[PDB]
Amino acid sequence: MRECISIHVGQAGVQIGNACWELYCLEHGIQPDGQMPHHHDSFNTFFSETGAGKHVPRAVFVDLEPTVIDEVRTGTYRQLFHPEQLITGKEDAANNYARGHYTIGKEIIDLVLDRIRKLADQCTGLQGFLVFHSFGGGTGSGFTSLLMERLSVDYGKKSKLEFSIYPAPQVSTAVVEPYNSILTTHTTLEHSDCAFMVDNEAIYDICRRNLDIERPTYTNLNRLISQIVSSITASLRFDGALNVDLTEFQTNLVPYPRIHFPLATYAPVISAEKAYHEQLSVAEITNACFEPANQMVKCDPRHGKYMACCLLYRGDVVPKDVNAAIATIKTKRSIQFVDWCPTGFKVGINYQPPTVVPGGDLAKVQRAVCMLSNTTAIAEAWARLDHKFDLMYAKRAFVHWYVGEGMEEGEFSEAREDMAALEKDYEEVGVDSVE
Amino acid sequence: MREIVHIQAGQCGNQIGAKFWEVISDEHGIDPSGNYVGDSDLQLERISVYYNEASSHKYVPRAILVDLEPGTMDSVRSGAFGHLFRPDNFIFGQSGAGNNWAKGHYTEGAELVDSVLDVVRKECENCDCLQGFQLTHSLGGGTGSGMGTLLISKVREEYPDRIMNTFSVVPSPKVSDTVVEPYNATLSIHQLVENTDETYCIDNEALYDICFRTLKLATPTYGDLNHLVSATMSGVTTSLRFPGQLNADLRKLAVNMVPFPRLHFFMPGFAPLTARGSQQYRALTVPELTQQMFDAKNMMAACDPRHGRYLTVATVFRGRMSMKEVDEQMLAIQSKNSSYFVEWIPNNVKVAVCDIPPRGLKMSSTFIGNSTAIQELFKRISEQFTAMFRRKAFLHWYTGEGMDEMEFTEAESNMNDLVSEYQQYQDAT
Amino acid sequence: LVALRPTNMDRERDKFFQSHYTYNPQFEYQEPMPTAVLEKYCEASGQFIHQAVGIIEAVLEKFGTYEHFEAATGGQLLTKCQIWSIVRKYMQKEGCAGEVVVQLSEDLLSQAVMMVENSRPTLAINLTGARQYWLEGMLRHQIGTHYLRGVNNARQPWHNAEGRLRYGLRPANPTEEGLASLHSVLFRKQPFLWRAALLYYTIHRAARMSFRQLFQDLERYVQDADVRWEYCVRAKRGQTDTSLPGCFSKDQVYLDGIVRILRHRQTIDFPLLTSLGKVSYEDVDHLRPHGVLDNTRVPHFMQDLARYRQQLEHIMATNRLDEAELGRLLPD
Ligand SMILES: Nc1nc2c(ncn2[C@@H]2O[C@H](COP(=O)(O)OP(=O)(O)OP(=O)(O)O)[C@@H](O)[C@H]2O)c(=O)[nH]1
Ligand SMILES: Nc1nc2c(ncn2[C@@H]2O[C@H](COP(=O)(O)OP(=O)(O)O)[C@@H](O)[C@H]2O)c(=O)[nH]1
Ligand SMILES: [Mg+2]
Ligand SMILES: [Zn+2]
């Protein structure tokens, strides 16, 4: 009776959703066709139920290119989703923000909102929104900005959580990533309650070093992000000794209206062969979470300060050990919070252990911990994007596409001003107080 | 007679209440179904004080379970010793406080407080002679803090004569389970020092320390901590739920322990606390209990008593014992720790003795110390609040629900005044 | 400055301008007025009035107008981006990166003000009229002087009011703003102390003049009505009915400090003076035995001390404040 819908925009969102809903259907013992042969209700929060034993997800898969959605319709998860939700456009934004926010997406935004409204009104205790969207793709940035503005107009005060794919510092598949990123950030900065920074480069690094797989496909990154999402929602979807709802997330991890970009982290991530040879202490996994090499965003936390942290544990966990481990973490100097926030933790414990997906890469563990940490190091990352933007704007490169697709240069200048203001705010907060 | 009404706010309050009712039912010999299968009539001679005899000879606890999220409520409902609460009692909302006090006291709470007060009124009219209210809640969680303060204010409006008990789980000094807990603590304390008769401060840190060192348990689950707090509460009420050579009631404790209207914050303590193995290697005598109850390593509030003075002390024993022995022990302990007591309160040990052990044991004891050391606690919190207010961090969440800064200014000033009063009376002469 | 910035400054400015500078502003303030501070700075001094005018005339002789002086010596007007860039470079150079919040505003009566917002240091920079070669100086003033002195002072026994009394300290000013003003023009090629001199002058006249009269009087030195409006308001901070004579004499501190420090530069230990915190140059010998100097910070521009002193000589020469004149001014 605490419902929460999922909205997947763009190819990244759709594939991540494939992984996430595979994970869920595995968790609650749900067959791909919605049937099912500590649990409570549990699945009601994400699965609505029809008359028969068939459950359907509360997901809205929207895209402008029918390729990936068609793959979904043809995949093993064909019987599952409500066929009306799988909204497909005709011509994708083609990595162009203007197309994804002014020209094309403007013609199916209404249908998407209609399906959203139907799903919302069929629910009673709606908690909030989960937008799964990338940052570089045109559909992702543009359509997500449009959709967030529309929802914020419609649903005045409700939780709105995003899982952006922050553009990596050195590996970029697109060429216009700075433009899409800056525009979508300038837009979503006033509507998204709490984003969730994740990058592909860091996940490549983690897969190579920790899991000992040298050649990972997007399937593996998707599985990892799905595990993170499942750990986020395990509080709603299960009985825990200290539960937490998404409103608690936005209250705890967001000190100021604008600074709401916490980065994700998960532990333990160890291969099946290395599953033994370590007992996986909860203090050990806490240390793993705080290890700068385990974060899922290519930013060294040591260059900034953790303004807030939220650690969600699951499995056979005992609160005293968590208290001891967090005390130890607070003792060390290399992990230096801001002076003005003396209490830098929210703790949540769940009774259900993480479940390993068959054919997966990780090993069956009894304890797991997902850290959502809002720090100041991420600020430097913005600088990089800013820098890129400046160069690609100093020559007015690629500007003609956006200009001719329903946008003006003054908008680019304004978004640059907004990003500069955000960087200024991060720097100002990073300083210490007097007296 | 002297029936007591139980209120449970916030998730911690509800879990503590579940364990508490388990303990009470074990005391009176009550089956999980709610029917009496006991063996001693004295169980039923005062069964009415906490229970109501429903028809067909059943018993229902006088509980009023309140929350804003149906999760923990349903957990209680499904689990054993949940099937005897009267199902109409489970008041719960849908929005959830979101760990915010503004939601828990202004926006969300304003929609359920009316139904809660209505069920309260029904239970009050049901009772013969109401004795008082005991509220079990937190101070960090939004629901607990906000809604409990609102309920306390409303009840004190509608019953300015009854007596008020609160078991508020104070935030621990070292760890911080939440991030905005200074704000919730300050606002809740403002309301409490406004309209409460007594407040039983508890920290999870001290309970961790006790379960670790004294009980020799490396795996303290929340069940055990709640079990300890439940044993403390049962010890507090057994003075009237049971006969005794020197009986006590809640009003007696309130009169004895509260010299001034504001200074009514007590730290509890329990004894004996013996590990599974280290029990048969110790003698269970009144001197042993008495000496156990006076030390920092057995105070359920994380603050050394030695840093201040005991303004007053109450001590409730159980099981068959000799009064002269207790008197001698109290005399000795008041003699040797002369610097640990306030000069201008001679003979500052209130004593009560019951006749029934808390099950399984020969004799137990409960300590309720109103000291000046707790000022440190408030000091700590106050400072934290100040810091998080100097930058106005997290301020927007609370501002967006109608509350404004001047609320925080007044609350902080009030808490500082309280600390000043504690300091003044600590060094009085 | 927040308390003495009139609450109706805009409505009175439009009135003043729209009347072609004949109207006398009727200012109002946030209650209560800081009566003690108003009374402390209710009288203007004329001790260095001829030095002020000396500096002003030296500028106008070389550059003709202030307008040309500003543009020729100040450099280009800066964008927000350029300001942040220069600030970031400075903080790193000073070793105080990440300590101070930086804010950009249009409603400052000065170039910048160092504050304590949320019990934490805040540098507010006026984006209106920020210039390339001048901005670096502002940072040497607010951060290099005010901030570093502040942090050093917090470590000293005289870190609060009681501590000042106990150790018998003279006021921080005029040494504080004197040092800060010298530091603003430190590495400039034409380090004229225009701002200090004109503030000193304007206050001197404000004591005798109505707003109308004061505004007209300044025309001789600076044409821009907006610039003149700033100087007039600063000089008449706290005055309600500006039709009457009267001033807030605080801003005379800059020139007052400059002259005194330059006069006694040969006997002042400038690193030590900064290390001891918010102290008068006269208290250095008194306080040296009681100062804790282990982890006190000296500004980067003071490391090459030989060069620092050369700059001070260059500043005197430029501003027509030669040794002999300082000698006669203060026969100490
Ligand atoms: N983590 C993860 N990221 C993916 C995956 N597939 C694609 N991406 C991200 O998607 C980005 C490419 O832009 P997209 O958002 O996919 O563009 P789109 O969704 O196809 O929408 P258009 O821009 O209109 O084509 C790349 O930067 C990838 O990081 C995936 O399987 N896992
Ligand atoms: N002693 C004890 N304290 C608890 C327990 N569970 C939660 N708490 C405390 O309750 C606080 C959380 O408040 P909670 O009721 O869960 O949040 P709310 O819904 O906003 O009221 C935390 O500070 C915990 O320290 C428990 O089982 N025992
Ligand atoms: Mg696409
Ligand atoms: Zn200054």
Tab-separated table of C-alpha atoms in Angstrom, chain C:
chain	number	residue	atom	x	y	z
C	1	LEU	CA	27.580	47.707	6.647
C	2	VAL	CA	24.325	45.659	6.485
C	3	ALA	CA	22.796	47.534	9.455
C	4	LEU	CA	23.628	51.022	8.084
C	5	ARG	CA	22.624	50.274	4.471
C	6	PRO	CA	19.311	52.233	4.216
C	7	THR	CA	16.235	50.019	3.789
C	8	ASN	CA	14.815	52.540	1.272
C	9	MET	CA	18.055	53.325	-0.625
C	10	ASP	CA	16.613	52.523	-4.083
C	11	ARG	CA	13.405	54.569	-3.710
C	12	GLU	CA	15.492	57.530	-2.462
C	13	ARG	CA	18.055	57.122	-5.278
C	14	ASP	CA	15.347	57.261	-7.977
C	15	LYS	CA	13.912	60.323	-6.169
C	16	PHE	CA	17.375	61.978	-6.081
C	17	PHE	CA	18.216	61.274	-9.743
C	18	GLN	CA	14.701	62.151	-11.021
C	19	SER	CA	14.880	65.551	-9.235
C	20	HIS	CA	18.201	66.226	-11.036
C	21	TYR	CA	20.209	65.912	-7.793
C	22	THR	CA	18.306	68.645	-5.862
C	23	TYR	CA	16.347	66.333	-3.508
C	24	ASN	CA	17.774	65.425	-0.084
C	25	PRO	CA	17.389	61.657	0.614
C	26	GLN	CA	15.249	60.796	3.669
C	27	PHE	CA	16.778	57.418	4.572
C	28	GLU	CA	15.300	54.811	6.932
C	29	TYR	CA	17.022	51.841	8.581
C	30	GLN	CA	16.349	48.443	10.165
C	31	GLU	CA	15.459	49.093	13.833
C	32	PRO	CA	17.117	49.541	16.166
C	33	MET	CA	19.946	51.744	14.892
C	34	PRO	CA	23.414	50.915	16.355
C	35	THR	CA	23.432	54.158	18.394
C	36	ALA	CA	26.807	53.425	20.047
C	37	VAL	CA	28.603	52.967	16.692
C	38	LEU	CA	26.885	56.012	15.122
C	39	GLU	CA	28.046	58.174	18.059
C	40	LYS	CA	31.586	56.728	17.876
C	41	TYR	CA	31.895	57.804	14.222
C	42	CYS	CA	29.769	61.003	14.311
C	43	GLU	CA	32.774	63.368	13.982
C	44	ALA	CA	35.048	63.641	10.922
C	45	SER	CA	38.796	64.287	11.130
C	46	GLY	CA	40.849	66.652	8.960
C	47	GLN	CA	44.279	65.432	10.065
C	48	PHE	CA	45.123	63.953	6.646
C	49	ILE	CA	42.733	65.954	4.415
C	50	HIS	CA	45.652	67.475	2.447
C	51	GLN	CA	47.126	64.008	1.877
C	52	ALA	CA	43.755	62.825	0.546
C	53	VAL	CA	43.512	65.790	-1.823
C	54	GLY	CA	47.207	65.257	-2.650
C	55	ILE	CA	46.458	61.710	-3.849
C	56	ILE	CA	43.293	62.716	-5.728
C	57	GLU	CA	45.094	65.567	-7.557
C	58	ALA	CA	48.098	63.304	-8.325
C	59	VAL	CA	45.707	60.938	-10.134
C	60	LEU	CA	43.887	63.704	-12.034
C	61	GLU	CA	47.224	65.312	-13.025
C	62	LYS	CA	48.487	62.076	-14.572
C	63	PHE	CA	45.205	60.662	-15.959
C	64	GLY	CA	43.038	63.775	-16.392
C	65	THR	CA	39.875	62.124	-15.045
C	66	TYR	CA	39.006	59.228	-12.745
C	67	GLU	CA	37.113	57.647	-15.654
C	68	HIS	CA	40.379	57.278	-17.627
C	69	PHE	CA	42.366	56.274	-14.500
C	70	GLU	CA	39.874	53.457	-13.819
C	71	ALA	CA	39.924	52.059	-17.367
C	72	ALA	CA	43.667	52.540	-17.997
C	73	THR	CA	44.933	51.088	-14.687
C	74	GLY	CA	42.015	48.840	-13.656
C	75	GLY	CA	41.789	46.714	-16.792
C	76	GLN	CA	38.654	45.264	-18.367
C	77	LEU	CA	35.353	44.686	-16.559
C	78	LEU	CA	35.157	41.006	-15.555
C	79	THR	CA	32.537	38.335	-16.225
C	80	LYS	CA	31.431	36.013	-13.410
C	81	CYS	CA	33.569	33.230	-14.924
C	82	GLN	CA	36.696	35.419	-14.880
C	83	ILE	CA	36.061	36.495	-11.270
C	84	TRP	CA	35.743	32.867	-10.068
C	85	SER	CA	38.891	31.930	-11.999
C	86	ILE	CA	40.975	34.707	-10.390
C	87	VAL	CA	39.545	33.913	-6.926
C	88	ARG	CA	40.271	30.169	-7.230
C	89	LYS	CA	43.864	30.900	-8.306
C	90	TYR	CA	44.252	33.265	-5.327
C	91	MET	CA	42.887	30.865	-2.666
C	92	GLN	CA	45.339	28.177	-3.822
C	93	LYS	CA	48.207	30.703	-3.853
C	94	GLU	CA	47.331	31.675	-0.256
C	95	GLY	CA	46.900	28.044	0.882
C	96	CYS	CA	43.335	28.710	2.095
C	97	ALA	CA	41.563	26.783	-0.681
C	98	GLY	CA	38.130	25.495	0.379
C	99	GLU	CA	37.888	27.572	3.583
C	100	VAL	CA	35.802	30.515	2.340
C	101	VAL	CA	32.443	30.606	0.552
C	102	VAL	CA	32.458	33.024	-2.395
C	103	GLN	CA	29.292	34.923	-3.406
C	104	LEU	CA	28.590	37.377	-6.238
C	105	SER	CA	26.273	40.357	-5.663
C	106	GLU	CA	25.205	43.675	-7.278
C	107	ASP	CA	24.020	45.360	-4.034
C	108	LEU	CA	27.345	46.050	-2.257
C	109	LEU	CA	28.421	49.596	-1.349
C	110	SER	CA	32.048	48.426	-1.784
C	111	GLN	CA	34.040	46.107	-4.088
C	112	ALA	CA	33.805	43.260	-1.560
C	113	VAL	CA	32.882	42.475	2.071
C	114	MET	CA	34.278	39.612	4.183
C	115	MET	CA	31.506	38.264	6.460
C	116	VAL	CA	30.556	35.504	8.920
C	117	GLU	CA	27.319	33.985	7.515
C	118	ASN	CA	26.119	30.722	9.142
C	119	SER	CA	29.032	31.049	11.637
C	120	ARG	CA	31.367	30.576	8.614
C	121	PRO	CA	33.538	32.962	6.516
C	122	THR	CA	31.851	34.371	3.388
C	123	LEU	CA	33.471	36.590	0.726
C	124	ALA	CA	30.834	38.644	-1.117
C	125	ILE	CA	32.236	40.220	-4.308
C	126	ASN	CA	30.481	43.046	-6.166
C	127	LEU	CA	30.180	41.936	-9.803
C	128	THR	CA	29.229	45.522	-10.772
C	129	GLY	CA	32.530	47.209	-11.703
C	130	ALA	CA	34.871	44.273	-10.992
C	131	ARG	CA	38.098	44.808	-13.014
C	132	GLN	CA	41.075	42.642	-14.027
C	133	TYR	CA	44.092	44.314	-12.370
C	134	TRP	CA	42.007	45.629	-9.442
C	135	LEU	CA	40.330	42.316	-8.397
C	136	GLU	CA	43.621	40.659	-7.370
C	137	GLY	CA	44.105	43.600	-4.978
C	138	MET	CA	40.667	43.116	-3.403
C	139	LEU	CA	41.656	39.521	-2.629
C	140	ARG	CA	44.943	40.712	-1.043
C	141	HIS	CA	42.818	43.097	1.064
C	142	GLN	CA	39.981	40.798	2.205
C	143	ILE	CA	41.717	37.416	2.183
C	144	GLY	CA	45.418	38.288	2.394
C	145	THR	CA	44.784	40.690	5.305
C	146	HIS	CA	41.305	40.535	6.954
C	147	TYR	CA	40.844	36.747	6.718
C	148	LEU	CA	44.413	35.715	7.656
C	149	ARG	CA	44.500	38.210	10.554
C	150	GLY	CA	41.110	36.819	11.674
C	151	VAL	CA	42.260	33.179	11.656
C	152	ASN	CA	45.526	34.083	13.433
C	153	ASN	CA	43.580	36.153	15.993
C	154	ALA	CA	41.271	33.222	16.803
C	155	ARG	CA	44.358	31.320	18.028
C	156	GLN	CA	45.449	34.147	20.407
C	157	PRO	CA	44.563	34.880	24.088
C	158	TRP	CA	42.912	38.128	22.874
C	159	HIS	CA	40.585	36.278	20.455
C	160	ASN	CA	37.474	37.847	22.059
C	161	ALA	CA	36.411	41.073	23.849
C	162	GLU	CA	37.511	39.836	27.318
C	163	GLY	CA	40.890	38.775	25.916
C	164	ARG	CA	41.406	42.245	24.420
C	165	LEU	CA	40.666	43.891	27.802
C	166	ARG	CA	42.809	41.436	29.784
C	167	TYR	CA	45.848	41.938	27.498
C	168	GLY	CA	45.188	45.687	27.147
C	169	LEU	CA	44.832	45.967	23.378
C	170	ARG	CA	44.360	49.174	21.412
C	171	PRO	CA	41.609	48.875	18.733
C	172	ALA	CA	42.429	46.810	15.609
C	173	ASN	CA	41.665	49.832	13.442
C	174	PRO	CA	43.127	51.850	11.947
C	175	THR	CA	45.973	49.284	11.596
C	176	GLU	CA	43.600	46.661	10.128
C	177	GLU	CA	42.152	48.638	7.202
C	178	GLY	CA	45.425	50.548	6.742
C	179	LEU	CA	47.290	47.281	6.158
C	180	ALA	CA	44.461	45.962	3.954
C	181	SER	CA	44.450	49.137	1.792
C	182	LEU	CA	48.229	49.097	1.290
C	183	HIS	CA	47.946	45.428	0.316
C	184	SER	CA	45.219	46.132	-2.285
C	185	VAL	CA	47.586	48.330	-4.321
C	186	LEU	CA	50.731	46.278	-3.540
C	187	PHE	CA	51.896	44.940	-6.971
C	188	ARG	CA	50.191	47.565	-9.172
C	189	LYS	CA	52.266	49.689	-11.575
C	190	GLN	CA	50.349	52.857	-10.629
C	191	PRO	CA	49.335	52.168	-6.988
C	192	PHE	CA	47.330	55.368	-6.348
C	193	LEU	CA	45.194	55.159	-3.185
C	194	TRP	CA	42.196	56.815	-4.847
C	195	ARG	CA	39.420	54.987	-2.944
C	196	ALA	CA	41.005	55.686	0.478
C	197	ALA	CA	41.656	59.361	-0.339
C	198	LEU	CA	38.195	60.082	-1.794
C	199	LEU	CA	36.423	58.351	1.127
C	200	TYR	CA	38.482	60.453	3.570
C	201	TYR	CA	37.666	63.631	1.606
C	202	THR	CA	33.932	62.865	1.201
C	203	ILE	CA	33.459	62.306	4.956
C	204	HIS	CA	35.267	65.559	5.767
C	205	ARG	CA	32.806	67.460	3.535
C	206	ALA	CA	29.770	65.367	4.611
C	207	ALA	CA	30.229	66.689	8.176
C	208	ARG	CA	29.587	70.228	6.823
C	209	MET	CA	27.223	69.514	3.910
C	210	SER	CA	23.779	68.270	2.947
C	211	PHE	CA	23.548	65.294	0.562
C	212	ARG	CA	22.748	67.648	-2.346
C	213	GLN	CA	25.796	69.803	-1.537
C	214	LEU	CA	28.069	66.777	-1.024
C	215	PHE	CA	26.968	65.178	-4.320
C	216	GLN	CA	27.647	68.435	-6.199
C	217	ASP	CA	30.998	68.959	-4.435
C	218	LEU	CA	32.306	65.571	-5.644
C	219	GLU	CA	31.653	66.469	-9.300
C	220	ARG	CA	35.097	68.122	-9.310
C	221	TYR	CA	36.778	64.711	-8.782
C	222	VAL	CA	34.387	62.177	-10.361
C	223	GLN	CA	31.617	62.703	-12.911
C	224	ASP	CA	29.723	59.392	-12.777
C	225	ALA	CA	26.493	59.960	-10.776
C	226	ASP	CA	26.335	56.295	-9.698
C	227	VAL	CA	29.910	56.388	-8.342
C	228	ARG	CA	29.159	59.673	-6.518
C	229	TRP	CA	25.919	58.246	-5.060
C	230	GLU	CA	27.907	55.357	-3.538
C	231	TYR	CA	30.493	57.682	-1.908
C	232	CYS	CA	27.742	60.005	-0.554
C	233	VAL	CA	25.717	57.170	1.038
C	234	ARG	CA	28.858	55.640	2.582
C	235	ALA	CA	29.737	59.047	4.086
C	236	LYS	CA	26.164	59.580	5.392
C	237	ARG	CA	25.407	56.015	6.625
C	238	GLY	CA	22.966	56.313	9.522
C	239	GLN	CA	21.819	59.848	8.685
C	240	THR	CA	18.023	59.864	8.344
C	241	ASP	CA	17.412	63.450	7.151
C	242	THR	CA	20.450	64.035	4.887
C	243	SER	CA	19.412	67.687	4.316
C	244	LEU	CA	21.367	68.445	7.516
C	245	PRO	CA	25.191	68.249	7.882
C	246	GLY	CA	26.604	65.034	9.366
C	247	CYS	CA	28.656	61.936	8.603
C	248	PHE	CA	29.591	58.379	9.471
C	249	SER	CA	33.355	58.842	9.798
C	250	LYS	CA	34.298	55.117	9.709
C	251	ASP	CA	35.700	55.132	6.147
C	252	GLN	CA	38.377	57.694	7.133
C	253	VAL	CA	40.129	54.693	8.728
C	254	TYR	CA	41.698	53.629	5.399
C	255	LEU	CA	43.847	56.725	4.770
C	256	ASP	CA	44.389	57.184	8.520
C	257	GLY	CA	45.838	53.652	8.709
C	258	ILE	CA	47.880	53.996	5.496
C	259	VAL	CA	49.677	57.148	6.667
C	260	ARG	CA	50.458	55.724	10.121
C	261	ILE	CA	51.747	52.361	8.873
C	262	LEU	CA	53.884	53.985	6.145
C	263	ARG	CA	55.260	56.510	8.666
C	264	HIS	CA	56.339	53.678	11.010
C	265	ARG	CA	57.088	50.974	8.396
C	266	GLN	CA	60.803	50.887	9.344
C	267	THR	CA	60.038	49.760	12.939
C	268	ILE	CA	57.064	47.459	12.121
C	269	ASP	CA	57.562	43.691	11.734
C	270	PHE	CA	54.876	42.997	9.114
C	271	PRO	CA	54.880	39.146	9.332
C	272	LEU	CA	54.661	39.373	13.152
C	273	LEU	CA	51.975	42.082	12.888
C	274	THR	CA	49.829	39.743	10.757
C	275	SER	CA	50.649	36.666	12.918
C	276	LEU	CA	49.424	38.357	16.144
C	277	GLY	CA	45.914	38.818	14.691
C	278	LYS	CA	43.575	41.828	14.964
C	279	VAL	CA	46.168	44.041	16.726
C	280	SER	CA	47.472	47.625	16.405
C	281	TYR	CA	51.011	48.144	15.026
C	282	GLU	CA	51.703	49.903	18.340
C	283	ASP	CA	50.869	46.761	20.395
C	284	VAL	CA	53.387	44.459	18.650
C	285	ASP	CA	56.149	44.743	21.299
C	286	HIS	CA	53.566	44.559	24.120
C	287	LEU	CA	51.951	41.374	22.734
C	288	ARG	CA	54.966	39.565	21.209
C	289	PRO	CA	55.789	37.739	24.514
C	290	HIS	CA	52.173	36.459	24.790
C	291	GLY	CA	51.471	35.530	21.149
C	292	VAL	CA	51.191	31.896	20.013
C	293	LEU	CA	52.906	31.825	16.614
C	294	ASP	CA	53.406	28.110	15.833
C	295	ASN	CA	50.632	27.707	13.244
C	296	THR	CA	49.874	31.330	12.318
C	297	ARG	CA	49.664	32.182	8.605
C	298	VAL	CA	51.498	35.027	6.834
C	299	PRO	CA	50.196	36.084	3.353
C	300	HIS	CA	52.074	34.833	0.247
C	301	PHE	CA	52.976	38.403	-0.823
C	302	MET	CA	54.941	38.901	2.429
C	303	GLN	CA	57.308	35.893	1.917
C	304	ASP	CA	59.697	37.979	-0.193
C	305	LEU	CA	59.895	40.661	2.501
C	306	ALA	CA	62.622	42.704	0.758
C	307	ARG	CA	60.276	43.073	-2.237
C	308	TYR	CA	57.301	43.836	0.037
C	309	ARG	CA	59.180	46.837	1.502
C	310	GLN	CA	60.175	48.057	-1.986
C	311	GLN	CA	56.470	48.014	-2.896
C	312	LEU	CA	55.673	50.173	0.174
C	313	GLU	CA	58.322	52.707	-0.978
C	314	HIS	CA	56.777	52.634	-4.478
C	315	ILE	CA	53.337	53.269	-2.934
C	316	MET	CA	54.614	56.317	-1.001
C	317	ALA	CA	56.395	57.803	-4.027
C	318	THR	CA	53.314	57.315	-6.215
C	319	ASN	CA	50.944	58.918	-3.665
C	320	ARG	CA	53.154	61.943	-2.807
C	321	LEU	CA	53.754	60.640	0.745
C	322	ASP	CA	57.557	60.962	0.957
C	323	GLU	CA	59.507	60.271	4.196
C	324	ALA	CA	60.023	63.968	5.052
C	325	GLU	CA	56.275	64.701	4.792
C	326	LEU	CA	55.335	61.694	6.959
C	327	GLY	CA	58.019	62.888	9.414
C	328	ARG	CA	56.383	66.332	9.769
C	329	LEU	CA	52.870	64.797	9.823
C	330	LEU	CA	53.687	62.530	12.787
C	331	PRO	CA	56.845	63.672	14.689
C	332	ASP	CA	56.779	60.414	16.712
